[PDB]
Amino acid sequence: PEYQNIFTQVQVQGPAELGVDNENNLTEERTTGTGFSQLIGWIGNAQLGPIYLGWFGIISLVTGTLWFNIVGFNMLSQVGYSIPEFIRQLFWLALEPPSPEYGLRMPPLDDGGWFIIASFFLLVSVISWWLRTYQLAEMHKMGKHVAWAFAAAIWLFLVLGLFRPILMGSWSEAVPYGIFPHLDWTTAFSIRYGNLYYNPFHALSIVFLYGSVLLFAMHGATILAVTRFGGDRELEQIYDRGTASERAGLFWRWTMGFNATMEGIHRWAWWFAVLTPITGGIGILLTGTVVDNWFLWAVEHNFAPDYTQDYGYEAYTTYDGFLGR
Amino acid sequence: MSKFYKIWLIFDPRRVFVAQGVFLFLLAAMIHLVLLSTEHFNWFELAAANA
Amino acid sequence: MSKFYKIWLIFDPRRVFVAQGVFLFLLAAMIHLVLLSTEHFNWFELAAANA
Amino acid sequence: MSKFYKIWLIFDPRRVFVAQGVFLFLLAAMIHLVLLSTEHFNWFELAAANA
Amino acid sequence: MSKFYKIWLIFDPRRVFVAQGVFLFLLAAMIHLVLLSTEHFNWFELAAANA
Amino acid sequence: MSKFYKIWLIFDPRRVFVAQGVFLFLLAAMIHLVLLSTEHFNWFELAAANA
Amino acid sequence: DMTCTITCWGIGVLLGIMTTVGLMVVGWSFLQGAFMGVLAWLIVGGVLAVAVCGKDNAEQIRAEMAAARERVRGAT
Amino acid sequence: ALLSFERKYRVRGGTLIGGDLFDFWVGPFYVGFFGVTTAFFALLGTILIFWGASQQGTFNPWLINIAPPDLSYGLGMAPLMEGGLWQIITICAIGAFVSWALREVEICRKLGMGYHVPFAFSVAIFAYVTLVVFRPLLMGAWGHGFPYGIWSHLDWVSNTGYAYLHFHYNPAHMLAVTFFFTTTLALALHGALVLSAANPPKGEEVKGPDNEDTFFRDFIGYSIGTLGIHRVGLLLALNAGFWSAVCIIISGPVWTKGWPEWWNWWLEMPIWP
Amino acid sequence: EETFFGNFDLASLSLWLFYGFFALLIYYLQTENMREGYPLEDEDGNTAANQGPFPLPKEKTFKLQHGRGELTLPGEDVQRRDNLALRKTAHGNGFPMEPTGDPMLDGVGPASWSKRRDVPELDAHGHPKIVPMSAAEGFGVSAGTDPRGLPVMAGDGEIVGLVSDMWIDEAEQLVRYLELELDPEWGDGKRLVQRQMVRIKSDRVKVRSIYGKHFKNVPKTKSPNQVTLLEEDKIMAYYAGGTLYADESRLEPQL
Amino acid sequence: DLSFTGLTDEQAQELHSVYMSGLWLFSAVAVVAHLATFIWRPWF
Amino acid sequence: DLSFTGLTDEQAQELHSVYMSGLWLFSAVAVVAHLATFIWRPWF
Amino acid sequence: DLSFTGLTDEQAQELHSVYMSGLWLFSAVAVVAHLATFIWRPWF
Amino acid sequence: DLSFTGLTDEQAQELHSVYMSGLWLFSAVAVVAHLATFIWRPWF
Amino acid sequence: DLSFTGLTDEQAQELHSVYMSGLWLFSAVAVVAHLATFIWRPWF
Ligand code: BCL
Ligand code: BCL
Ligand SMILES: CC[C@H]1c2cc3[nH]c4c(c3C)C(=O)[C@H](C(=O)OC)c4c3nc(cc4[nH]c(cc(n2)[C@@H]1C)c(C(C)=O)c4C)[C@@H](C)[C@@H]3CCC(=O)OC/C=C(\C)CCC[C@H](C)CCC[C@H](C)CCCC(C)C
Ligand SMILES: CC[C@H]1c2cc3[nH]c4c(c3C)C(=O)[C@H](C(=O)OC)c4c3nc(cc4[nH]c(cc(n2)[C@@H]1C)c(C(C)=O)c4C)[C@@H](C)[C@@H]3CCC(=O)OC/C=C(\C)CCC[C@H](C)CCC[C@H](C)CCCC(C)C
Ligand SMILES: COC1=C(OC)C(=O)C(C/C=C(\C)CC/C=C(\C)CC/C=C(\C)CC/C=C(\C)CC/C=C(\C)CC/C=C(\C)CC/C=C(/C)CC/C=C(\C)CC/C=C(\C)CCC=C(C)C)=C(C)C1=O
Ligand SMILES: COC(C)(C)C(=O)C/C=C(\C)CC/C=C(\C)CC/C=C(\C)CCCC/C(C)=C/CCC(C)CC/C=C(/C)CCC=C(C)C
Ligand SMILES: COC(C)(C)C(=O)C/C=C(\C)CC/C=C(\C)CC/C=C(\C)CCCC/C(C)=C/CCC(C)CC/C=C(\C)CCC=C(C)C
Ligand SMILES: COC(C)(C)C(=O)C/C=C(\C)CC/C=C(\C)CC/C=C(\C)CCCC/C(C)=C/CCC(C)CC/C=C(\C)CCC=C(C)C
Ligand SMILES: COC(C)(C)C(=O)C/C=C(\C)CC/C=C(\C)CC/C=C(\C)CCCC/C(C)=C/CCC(C)CC/C=C(\C)CCC=C(C)C
Ligand SMILES: COC(C)(C)C(=O)C/C=C(\C)CC/C=C(\C)CC/C=C(\C)CCCC/C(C)=C/CCC(C)CC/C=C(\C)CCC=C(C)C
Ligand SMILES: COC(C)(C)C(=O)C/C=C(\C)CC/C=C(\C)CC/C=C(\C)CCCC/C(C)=C/CCC(C)CC/C=C(\C)CCC=C(C)C
Ligand SMILES: COC(C)(C)C(=O)C/C=C(\C)CC/C=C(\C)CC/C=C(\C)CCCC/C(C)=C\CCC(C)CC/C=C(\C)CCC=C(C)C
Ligand SMILES: [Fe+3]
């Protein structure tokens, strides 16, 4: 069959690229030293590094390391400092949020103090990383779309961790730091407040997540289809339209009656991805503070389905018949 | 001990200042929070109980 | 003590001013909320209980 | 023993200084944390128990 | 035994020194933690039980 | 057995040295841990039993 | 020389299967044996690919190539 | 009404079947053999759905529910009011999806490009067929499929998830969720980078691929390239679909007990003291 | 919590506000994507009577690098072809077109190319982006099979020549083109093949798109050290047109 | 004289004078506020 | 003289002088605060 | 001489002397703190 | 004289001597610590 | 002869001699360790 352009047939290697520069002097903070990976060269680029080391990055790294070490050492101490038992129960341990009886006051170290300290460190680290991603775009002379799309997810992060506990007046409304405990928190939160399926904003966030996954599948397939016309060089196609863009647009116009441009599809992708955490945070912020039962809300607003048939196994079969006796 | 000024011949005067400021603020906040967590050194609760 | 003016030869005034403003407002809001979280220092509840 | 000064002909002082500072601070922090985690050397609880 | 100095003609001393330091520190920490993991040699608990 | 020195005319000494250094330590650690996983050869528990 | 690496990966997969079956023989369960077999696959396959396939074919080119780096070093 | 560059591409040929019998356009849409089949199947399915809605007693979009038969009917046919309409609509939907994929194949052949898009659509078709065909076939009854209702196809998901006590402990569910999240993050980053490169601050020149490569190497220390990102996104989406299908298909016919108990192999390994 | 009127509460207000915002966002997104290809035309080249429900957007300006000027969109079509050898098969709209001469030589159908600028694409330094491997210092093959020196087999099993060079992308370290030296029987000179349409084997390189007799009419580059966007388009599309026009069986229904 | 930012001695001195004046005013206002709060509801 | 940042002996000496001048004031304030806290609520 | 970092013997000796003085001061402080803690609360 | 790093035979002796001295000091410290621990609590 | 790494015959002989001496001393220590372990607690 024809070449499908999933793996590269032959690789070439030249002198390492150090990066572009301007009067802002990005070179003064970049590291020296690069590597090449032939295993990754089958899919993408082979050069590894260098990286830019500012102050926001160092602060974020140190503070996130502190949070990681606090959580890990608390989990280790909870098991008796036994390394085999620490390894055995790794997925089951956690650092629990404070008890409901303490409200918004600072709890003791045994019942949530370390949780608050680690949460403060994690918040500082995340904000430092966001500031770094803004500063890099400001110094290379580019737009700030990356910072906005990160802020989109930071919004849901903050809603799940900071704003909602303050609105509900308790530090016990946060999420524990664990693998299985956090899934347990998800399920318990869903059960406690009715059914989260009947929250309209959860449905909207699900809609946008599905749309975003569908849109990347479509765009990846489309770009790999027209790569024989140099379709992967999107910027030059935007500045000077070629046949690849025309064919890509005509495919979708003949398929579903409307199409896009080489620059407009990226706007669609940006918005579908960004709209998910925003709707999710808006929906989460209204739970408990405004609505306490979502199934009752749906019933009162008349979009809860009704069933006619009966309940129970004895209405459909027999216990002996099920066993085959 | 009289020749400790040579640290400025090894380190920049701006990075040290920024790191020192951030470190000092974080440590002070952490110590104040740790003090607030106990039942004997919480000034708010002691003032509340003494009224 | 009298040569503290030299700090402006190292730090850019713009960044320092922006950070100072953000830090001051955030610290004031955090302290106000921390007072509001207690029972003795909540002026709204004290006013409500006064009458 | 007397030739220990040759380490500065092999290692760059700038990196090892930062590494030493970070390691010392981390070690002190974890040792103080371990002391705080026990019921025999917790001075905050000792203050409450004594008075 | 008298020609062991030739090892430095094969390996660069910088990487060897860094690896040796990291390995020694990690091994010491692991051994101290293992001693902490038992009941007989847990010195903090032994001190707590002798008061 | 007098011509065993030719192995250095084929194998790279540095790679072999690194591999042996890793392997010997790994085997020693596994042997010590295996000795620790039994009852008759556990000195940590034997000390507590005889105390 | 990707063919030798693929051969090493296949050898690792076969060794993992063999170790899994042996662990069934000893008295373990399916998943307990499978986890150790997968470990063996990744570790032994990676080790063989790095070591054996790192011996790229050369008879006299290797020596002068080795000697060339012995001259760059010593003056840098 | 054509685009200003469309006319030269509107040539004849590239049909799998039909020749020039169905080789024309209706507005922007392209018609063929499979376009005719798609139109027939979709119209029949929609009209049957609205007939069932009329016979149910409600036209509310939120409350229309067409459900599969009872488990006692097995793999046989049920009365059209007691769940047979669901089977007919399922057949129509399968036909329509296959016809849509083959029409995409024909359009790709006519335009002279690759066949990646129909291959990607085949994975979603596979997931749907696994949901409505393969799992009910293995379990032994057509009543294991989900109903055709906007709000009634979520109660089925809830009850099926709670039939195993804790569905979050399913490892394939974990893999699929991780793939979904990674795909969303990658799409956001790609869109943001392209838009920022093409839209600089006012009064500044546009940028190129070198600028993007530098940015991500400064940001995180690695850049995948303008060609590897599309491969990565396509692979992530396909993997998400495949592992969703695997997770749903292993829940019923292979595992029967609760999902948390599956980890007893790890919790009871002989190596632990 | 209470309600403003009836069952209307804060959640309903948020939902309706989101409805309005989403409607406006959909309008903006659809309008932003109409900067190329409008206004619509009929099959005779005249402006159509129907133009849709979305009006055209306003203008935006792009400032290009290397002193190439500015681009304002939406505007006139500068990539439009002038004289196309096509024939209508019907008197109205909605029916295909028929090639007049040789579709592969006339650049119609799947062999169509766009009238791009006749200048090479530049990298950050201002050099041509795609350069032959014999003029790039410090570049070499690091993995895979080296195709240089191997014979080239066409789509019908004919050997036309040997691979003599590769054209690489220095900025991104990727191979773009493979150069071919033709045997005197099959033509003269050298031709370029894009990397996406070849399959490198251990002993040969196969191009399945076109046959042996179609190799002499591949468009040639004017300069031996660089290629322009227009030439790349014509070369690349000529190669794509063979998937349909290289044989009569590739055009008729497969059944 | 040493200079990293790029200012001179006189400019730095004037900027520091203005900054210290503003800081002293703000500190005095805060001191009055704290004294009034302590009188209204004392801690310690 | 060994140098890595470009500073001279006199500049480094003056910078160290002012640095310790500030450090002593900070330490004195901290010591006064610690003594006051120990007087109010003793530990140890 | 062998020097991977571009330093001479005398500079290395000076840096070693200053580092040793700092290390001795730190060790003395640590010893005083440990003696005080052991006096306050023995752990052996 | 073989050398895979570039060091000379003369240079590769002083470093070995210093490393041996450091190893001896570490061994003496470890022996003292182990003797003290054995005195405090035997394990054999 | 059969050189691959860049060694001579006498260089390989010296390398082998030093390596074997080190290995045999390392094994000599372990032999005493094993006899001590056997004397403390037989395992056969
Ligand atoms: C109690 C509930 C359980 C649970 C129970 C289940 C069950 C049960 C299921 C999963 C499934 C999934 N779960 Mg789970 N799951 C839970 C909660 C979660 C959470 C979370 C808490 O965050 C997440 C992130 C997910 C996410 C997921 C995905 C991994 C997966 C979704 C399938 C999919 O997208 O296939 C997408 C594929 C398709 C079906 C698309 C089909 C499209 C077709 C081919 C085309 C449509 C054409 C259309 C009709 C055209 C008409 C339109 C015209 C314009 C008119 N689950 C909880 C814990 N989960 C589902 C799954 O894996 O399914 C296989 C599933 O059934
Ligand atoms: C029993 C389970 C309940 C349920 C309970 C919940 C709850 C509770 C929540 C979700 C939420 C979501 N649900 Mg639901 N949900 C259910 C069933 C489903 C099903 C299904 C059955 O198929 C689906 C498709 C989903 C899927 C979803 C998503 C649509 C949505 C997550 C938003 C998002 O962007 O997450 C992506 C995740 C994030 C963006 C988190 C933020 C990330 C930050 C930025 C991390 C910072 C980095 C970190 C600090 C550093 C790490 C270290 C690095 C290596 C350096 N749910 C059932 C009904 N669902 C969320 C929501 O918004 O709902 C309104 C939510 O809170
Ligand atoms: C999902 C995105 C997250 C991410 C990704 C990421 N970072 C990366 C990479 C990736 C994918 C690399 O490939 C690159 C790297 O070198 O990986 C080994 C790297 C990197 N990001 C780093 C740090 C880093 N990134 C961060 C951020 C992030 N990392 C993102 C949040 C952070 C945070 C959160 O604070 C840190 C601390 C560096 C460790 C490294 C930058 C590389 C560099 O500066 O030098 C590397 C080059 C060399 C000297 C040689 C190569 C390194 C090899 C490990 C040694 C030899 C291997 C051989 C050459 C081939 C490697 C084989 C492959 C299988 C890797
Ligand atoms: C549009 C919404 C989507 C989204 C977007 C998004 N996420 C983002 C961004 C954007 C636009 C970034 O720019 C930012 C980024 O850096 O991307 C590369 C990021 C990011 N989103 C992340 C995670 C994440 N995103 C998620 C989801 C989403 N983010 C949504 C689907 C999720 C989930 C739950 O689905 C997670 C878990 C990070 C990878 C990164 C944020 C990095 C950050 O904040 O780092 C702070 C630093 C620390 C906490 C220090 C960590 C220290 C470690 C202990 C070691 C150092 C790191 C190392 C690389 C790891 C270990 C490596 C080993 C080899 C040792
Ligand atoms: C860079 O590159 C890229 C591009 O480019 C630059 C792109 O653009 C895109 C594309 C991306 C976008 C445009 C972004 C937006 C996309 C999404 C949000 C995805 C989600 C999409 C939707 C929700 C819309 C999809 C709509 C569909 C599937 C329905 C449309 C279909 C029909 C109306 C019917 C199809 C018509 C057929 C089969 C032909 C008719 C059949 C016949 C037999 C003809 C005979 C005649 C008749 C039956 C009578 C006349 C018929 C009529 C009038 C038809 C209408 C009938 C009705 C009953 C109403 C991508 C990815 C890309 O990466
Ligand atoms: C980084 O890489 C390079 C190459 C540079 C290196 O290799 C560098 C290496 C280093 C920098 C290493 C540094 C090592 C140290 C600083 C080690 C220090 C070690 C100690 C100070 C150890 C002290 C141990 C004390 C112990 C075990 C005390 C025990 C006491 C008791 C059991 C109580 C018993 C009762 C009585 C009365 C005993 C009296 C007390 C005594 C201590 C004898
Ligand atoms: C960022 O980088 C650079 C280089 C710029 C810096 O390093 C800059 C750093 C700064 C600008 C730092 C600035 C720091 C401050 C402004 C700090 C200010 C600190 C205070 C005002 C602290 C006040 C503390 C007061 C306390 C603790 C009061 C306690 C009172 C009592 C406990 C009451 C009890 C009293 C009794 C019982 C009476 C008996 C007391 C006696 C003392 C006898
Ligand atoms: C952003 O960067 C730059 C450089 C621009 C800046 O940093 C700029 C910063 C600013 C422009 C800042 C501006 C700040 C303000 C305008 C602040 C204003 C503050 C106030 C007006 C504060 C008022 C506080 C009043 C209080 C606390 C009143 C309290 C009253 C009582 C408690 C009542 C009880 C009183 C009794 C019992 C009497 C006892 C009191 C006596 C005095 C006897
Ligand atoms: C985890 O364990 C628990 C929780 C128990 C803890 O609480 C643990 C706590 C610790 C381990 C705490 C450790 C604390 C320290 C090690 C603290 C160290 C603090 C310092 C070294 C502080 C130094 C402060 C210095 C200051 C404030 C200097 C100020 C200087 C100036 C204001 C003047 C500077 C101006 C200059 C140079 C301008 C001149 C410019 C020229 C160009 C000439
Ligand atoms: C109980 O079990 C667990 C695991 C929990 C433990 O607690 C385990 C704990 C350990 C294993 C702990 C181990 C601890 C160590 C090995 C600690 C070692 C510490 C040191 C070696 C510290 C060295 C400090 C040296 C110092 C402070 C020296 C100098 C400092 C200066 C500020 C000097 C300034 C120098 C200048 C200016 C250079 C001059 C410049 C010129 C240009 C000439
Ligand atoms: C990295 O690559 C290269 C090539 C460089 C290498 O391979 C390098 C390798 C090394 C550098 C290796 C280094 C190895 C060591 C430093 C090893 C050291 C080993 C010891 C110090 C071992 C000590 C063992 C002590 C033992 C076993 C003591 C036991 C005591 C008792 C059992 C107590 C009871 C004893 C009684 C009753 C005495 C009776 C015994 C008799 C024999 C009479
Ligand atoms: C000890 O051994 C070593 C050294 C190896 C280790 O260190 C081992 C370490 C580990 C094994 C670590 C393992 C760690 C995990 C498994 C971590 C898991 C973490 C999570 C799942 C975290 C989730 C976090 C957050 C979530 C789900 C949502 C929202 C959070 C927040 C918004 C947090 C921010 C908090 C705020 C704003 C409150 C701060 C409080 C104030 C008062 C300001
Ligand atoms: Fe793209």
Coordinates of all heavy atoms in Angstrom, one line a residue, chain I residues 30-63:
Chain I
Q30 N -18.2 31.2 13.3 CA -18.6 31.0 11.9 C -18.2 32.1 11.0 O -17.7 31.9 9.9 CB -20.1 30.7 11.7 CG -20.5 30.5 10.3 CD -19.8 29.4 9.6 OE1 -19.5 28.4 10.2 NE2 -19.4 29.6 8.3
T31 N -18.4 33.4 11.5 CA -18.0 34.5 10.6 C -16.5 34.6 10.4 O -16.0 35.0 9.4 CB -18.5 35.8 11.3 OG1 -20.0 35.8 11.2 CG2 -18.0 37.0 10.5
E32 N -15.7 34.2 11.5 CA -14.2 34.3 11.4 C -13.7 33.4 10.3 O -12.6 33.6 9.8 CB -13.6 33.9 12.7 CG -13.4 35.1 13.6 CD -12.3 36.1 13.2 OE1 -11.2 35.6 12.8 OE2 -12.6 37.3 13.2
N33 N -14.5 32.3 9.9 CA -14.0 31.3 9.0 C -14.4 31.6 7.5 O -14.4 30.6 6.7 CB -14.5 29.9 9.4 CG -13.6 29.3 10.5 OD1 -12.7 28.5 10.1 ND2 -13.8 29.7 11.7
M34 N -14.8 32.8 7.2 CA -15.2 33.1 5.9 C -14.3 34.2 5.2 O -14.7 35.0 4.5 CB -16.7 33.7 5.9 CG -17.6 32.7 6.5 SD -19.3 33.3 6.7 CE -19.4 34.3 5.2
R35 N -13.0 34.1 5.5 CA -12.0 35.0 5.0 C -11.3 34.5 3.7 O -10.5 35.2 3.1 CB -10.9 35.3 6.0 CG -11.5 35.8 7.3 CD -10.4 36.4 8.2 NE -10.7 37.8 8.4 CZ -11.2 38.3 9.5 NH1 -11.5 37.5 10.5 NH2 -11.4 39.6 9.6
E36 N -11.7 33.2 3.3 CA -11.1 32.7 2.0 C -12.3 32.0 1.3 O -13.0 31.2 1.8 CB -10.0 31.7 2.3 CG -9.0 32.1 3.3 CD -7.6 32.4 2.7 OE1 -7.4 32.0 1.6 OE2 -6.8 33.0 3.4
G37 N -12.4 32.3 0.0 CA -13.3 31.6 -0.9 C -14.6 32.3 -1.1 O -15.5 31.7 -1.8
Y38 N -14.8 33.5 -0.7 CA -16.0 34.2 -0.8 C -15.8 35.5 -1.6 O -14.7 36.1 -1.6 CB -16.6 34.6 0.6 CG -17.1 33.3 1.3 CD1 -16.3 32.6 2.1 CD2 -18.5 33.0 1.2 CE1 -16.7 31.5 2.8 CE2 -18.9 31.8 1.9 CZ -18.0 31.1 2.7 OH -18.5 30.0 3.3
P39 N -16.9 36.0 -2.3 CA -18.3 35.5 -2.4 C -18.4 34.3 -3.3 O -17.5 34.0 -4.1 CB -19.0 36.7 -3.0 CG -18.0 37.5 -3.8 CD -16.7 37.3 -3.0
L40 N -19.5 33.6 -3.1 CA -19.7 32.4 -3.9 C -20.1 32.7 -5.3 O -20.5 33.8 -5.7 CB -20.9 31.6 -3.3 CG -20.8 31.4 -1.8 CD1 -22.1 30.7 -1.2 CD2 -19.6 30.5 -1.4
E41 N -19.8 31.7 -6.2 CA -20.0 31.8 -7.6 C -20.8 30.6 -8.1 O -20.8 29.6 -7.5 CB -18.7 32.0 -8.4 CG -17.7 32.9 -7.8 CD -16.3 32.8 -8.4 OE1 -16.2 32.0 -9.4 OE2 -15.4 33.6 -8.0
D42 N -21.4 30.8 -9.3 CA -22.1 29.7 -10.0 C -21.1 28.9 -10.9 O -19.9 29.1 -10.8 CB -23.3 30.2 -10.7 CG -22.9 31.0 -11.9 OD1 -21.8 31.5 -12.0 OD2 -23.8 31.2 -12.8
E43 N -21.6 28.0 -11.7 CA -20.7 27.2 -12.5 C -20.3 27.9 -13.8 O -19.4 27.3 -14.5 CB -21.4 25.9 -12.9 CG -22.0 25.1 -11.7 CD -21.7 23.6 -11.7 OE1 -21.4 23.1 -12.8 OE2 -21.8 23.0 -10.7
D44 N -20.8 29.1 -14.1 CA -20.4 29.9 -15.2 C -19.4 30.9 -14.8 O -19.0 31.7 -15.7 CB -21.6 30.5 -15.9 CG -22.4 29.5 -16.8 OD1 -21.7 28.9 -17.6 OD2 -23.6 29.4 -16.6
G45 N -19.0 31.0 -13.6 CA -18.0 32.0 -13.1 C -18.7 33.3 -12.7 O -17.9 34.2 -12.2
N46 N -20.0 33.4 -12.7 CA -20.7 34.6 -12.3 C -21.0 34.5 -10.8 O -21.1 33.4 -10.2 CB -21.9 34.9 -13.1 CG -21.6 34.9 -14.6 OD1 -22.3 34.4 -15.4 ND2 -20.5 35.6 -15.0
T47 N -21.3 35.7 -10.2 CA -21.7 35.7 -8.8 C -23.1 35.1 -8.6 O -24.0 35.4 -9.4 CB -21.7 37.1 -8.3 OG1 -20.6 37.8 -8.8 CG2 -21.7 37.1 -6.7
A48 N -23.3 34.2 -7.7 CA -24.5 33.5 -7.4 C -25.6 34.5 -6.8 O -25.2 35.5 -6.2 CB -24.3 32.3 -6.5
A49 N -26.8 34.2 -7.0 CA -27.9 35.0 -6.4 C -28.0 34.8 -4.9 O -28.5 35.7 -4.2 CB -29.2 34.7 -7.1
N50 N -27.6 33.6 -4.4 CA -27.7 33.3 -3.0 C -26.3 33.3 -2.3 O -25.3 32.8 -2.9 CB -28.3 31.9 -2.7 CG -27.5 30.8 -3.4 OD1 -27.5 30.8 -4.7 ND2 -27.0 29.9 -2.6
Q51 N -26.1 34.0 -1.2 CA -24.9 34.2 -0.5 C -24.9 33.7 0.9 O -23.8 33.7 1.6 CB -24.4 35.6 -0.6 CG -24.2 36.2 -2.0 CD -23.1 35.5 -2.7 OE1 -22.0 35.4 -2.2 NE2 -23.3 35.2 -4.0
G52 N -26.0 33.1 1.4 CA -26.0 32.6 2.7 C -26.6 33.6 3.8 O -26.8 34.7 3.5
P53 N -26.7 33.1 5.0 CA -27.2 33.9 6.1 C -26.1 34.7 6.9 O -26.5 35.6 7.6 CB -28.0 33.0 7.0 CG -27.3 31.6 6.9 CD -26.9 31.5 5.4
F54 N -24.9 34.3 6.7 CA -23.8 35.0 7.4 C -23.1 36.0 6.5 O -22.5 35.7 5.5 CB -22.8 34.0 7.9 CG -23.3 33.1 9.0 CD1 -23.9 31.9 8.7 CD2 -23.1 33.4 10.3 CE1 -24.4 31.0 9.7 CE2 -23.5 32.6 11.3 CZ -24.2 31.4 11.0
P55 N -23.2 37.3 6.9 CA -22.5 38.3 6.1 C -21.0 38.2 6.2 O -20.4 37.6 7.2 CB -23.0 39.6 6.7 CG -23.4 39.3 8.1 CD -23.9 37.9 8.0
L56 N -20.3 38.8 5.3 CA -18.8 38.8 5.3 C -18.2 39.5 6.5 O -18.8 40.5 6.9 CB -18.3 39.4 4.0 CG -18.3 38.5 2.7 CD1 -17.2 38.9 1.7 CD2 -18.2 37.0 3.1
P57 N -17.1 39.0 7.0 CA -16.4 39.7 8.1 C -15.7 41.0 7.6 O -15.7 41.3 6.5 CB -15.5 38.7 8.6 CG -15.1 37.9 7.4 CD -16.4 37.8 6.5
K58 N -15.1 41.7 8.6 CA -14.3 42.8 8.3 C -12.9 42.5 8.1 O -12.5 41.3 8.2 CB -14.4 43.8 9.5 CG -15.9 44.3 9.7 CD -16.1 44.7 11.2 CE -16.2 46.2 11.4 NZ -14.8 46.7 11.5
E59 N -12.1 43.5 7.7 CA -10.7 43.2 7.3 C -9.7 43.1 8.4 O -9.9 43.8 9.4 CB -10.3 44.3 6.3 CG -11.0 44.3 4.9 CD -11.4 45.6 4.5 OE1 -10.5 46.5 4.1 OE2 -12.6 45.9 4.5
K60 N -8.7 42.3 8.2 CA -7.5 42.2 9.1 C -6.3 42.2 8.3 O -6.2 41.8 7.1 CB -7.6 41.0 10.0 CG -7.4 39.7 9.2 CD -7.4 38.5 10.1 CE -6.4 38.5 11.2 NZ -6.3 37.3 12.0
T61 N -5.2 42.7 8.9 CA -3.9 42.9 8.2 C -2.8 42.0 8.9 O -2.7 42.0 10.1 CB -3.5 44.4 8.2 OG1 -4.5 45.2 7.7 CG2 -2.2 44.5 7.4
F62 N -2.0 41.3 8.0 CA -0.9 40.5 8.5 C 0.4 41.2 8.0 O 0.5 41.7 6.8 CB -0.9 39.1 7.9 CG -2.0 38.2 8.5 CD1 -3.2 38.1 7.9 CD2 -1.7 37.6 9.7 CE1 -4.1 37.2 8.5 CE2 -2.6 36.7 10.3 CZ -3.8 36.6 9.7
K63 N 1.3 41.4 8.9 CA 2.6 42.0 8.6 C 3.6 40.9 8.5 O 4.0 40.2 9.5 CB 3.0 43.0 9.7 CG 4.5 43.3 9.7 CD 4.8 44.3 10.9 CE 3.8 45.4 11.0 NZ 4.6 46.7 11.2

